């Protein structure tokens, strides 16, 4: 890869396959987001097949591929990880044995942190107890951005919260899939639900006019 001044880029490695990449890209480059200028640089040690190559050709101007292994420092230097803004890892949810997957992911994290101790990492984990091990890596600063997503914990938590009030699982899960408004004119239940689903969640610093006011007051007037 050749770094381009004034433009960030990220590095994605892990379980690269057709459906996973399609889902990730479709969600990432959605129009509802603000203007984006980040290049995506994959990294895998298996030559892609024709379907995957066709997908990359379709997203020609903003996706690049490089064959290699994430455990090799030469490869890590090849994809220019020092100036990379963040590094992602994708996990195989439908694996036969969960523990092997967690072991592989932990090894990848250790290797990346060895090569560089200040990068920011986002990952996936299949069991709760395995997540505890990541707290022992010397340079795993979770006070800054360094996030592990435990699928089991989140899933069971969603269900448990649904126990108190029903429908909470759906209502939450629709807040993270960026969707555009869809209009249907015939009158059924689907119309209002489709109007609702179009929402997402965003964060932003407040204006200076609200510094001295009370929280309920500023929750109003907005």
């Amino acid at each position: 890869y050749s770094a381009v001044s004034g433009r960030k880029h990220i590095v994605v490695c892990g379980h690269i396959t057709l459906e996973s990449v399609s889902n990730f890209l479709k969600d990432f480059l959605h129009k509802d987001r603000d203007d984006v200028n980040v290049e995506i640089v994959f990294l895998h040690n298996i030559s892609p097949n024709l379907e995957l190559e066709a997908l990359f050709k379709r997203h020609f101007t903003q996706v690049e591929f490089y064959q290699g292994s994430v455990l090799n420092p030469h490869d890590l230097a090849r994809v220019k990880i020092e100036s990379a803004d963040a590094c992602l890892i994708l996990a195989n949810k439908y694996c036969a044995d969960p523990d092997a997957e967690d072991a592989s992911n932990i090894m990848r994290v250790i290797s990346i942190k060895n090569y560089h101790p200040k990068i920011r990492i986002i990952t996936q984990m299949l069991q709760y107890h395995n997540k505890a091990h990541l707290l022992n890596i010397p340079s795993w600063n979770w006070k800054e951005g360094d996030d592990a997503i435990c699928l089991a914990e989140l899933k069971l938590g969603f269900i448990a919260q649904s126990c108190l009030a029903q429908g909470l699982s759906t209502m939450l899960a629709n807040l993270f899939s960026m969707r555009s408004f869809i209009k249907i004119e015939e009158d059924t239940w689907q119309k209002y639900y489709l109007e609702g689903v179009s929402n997402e969640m965003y964060t932003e610093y407040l204006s200076s006019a609200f510094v001295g006011l009370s929280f309920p007051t500023v929750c109003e007037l907005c």
């Binding site: 090894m107 250790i110 091990h133 022992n136 890596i137 010397p138």
Partner: protein, 151 residues
């Protein structure tokens, strides 16, 4: 009273039953250990048997004054240790704490911040043919101690 060996080469003592040296997390807290040696193993039932006698023996040699010895504390699976306990019973000043070396509580219970050395070994390294997963335990355990925080 028999103190040295038959051949006058090592320190010797009467055999002792295993339960007289097993400690608990609370129990080891009251005892104060300084300048000792802590040994971590990853064995279990049905694994290759490394001969721990060759390790402890050089420490408990002669030409060491009785007050000059180094206390030894094992940390690991009690099931594994019982298999070879008979060989090490004669050696003096040996103590065993059941636990896991990854459990950060145990490494605090024994005063690891006041130690002379900390050996880490493996047992089933030959059994596994998966190169990536080989030596995962030893690597991970070593890094754990690196990130420790002390007052």
């Amino acid at each position: 009273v028999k103190k040295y060996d038959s051949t006058g080469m090592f320190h010797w003592c009467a055999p002792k039953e295993i339960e007289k040296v097993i400690l608990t997390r609370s129990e080891a807290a009251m005892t104060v250990l300084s300048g000792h040696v802590v040994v971590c193993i990853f064995g279990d039932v049905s694994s290759a048997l490394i001969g721990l006698r060759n390790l402890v023996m050089p420490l408990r040699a002669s030409n060491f004054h009785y007050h000059e010895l180094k206390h030894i504390v094992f940390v690991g699976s009690i099931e594994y240790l019982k298999r070879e306990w008979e060989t090490l019973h004669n050696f003096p000043k040996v103590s065993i704490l059941p636990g896991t070396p990854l459990s950060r509580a145990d490494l605090r219970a024994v005063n690891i911040n006041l130690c002379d050395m900390c050996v880490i070994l493996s047992a089933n390294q030959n059994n596994i043919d998966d190169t990536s997963l080989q030596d995962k335990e030893c690597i991970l355990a070593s890094l754990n101690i690196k990130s420790m925080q002390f007052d």
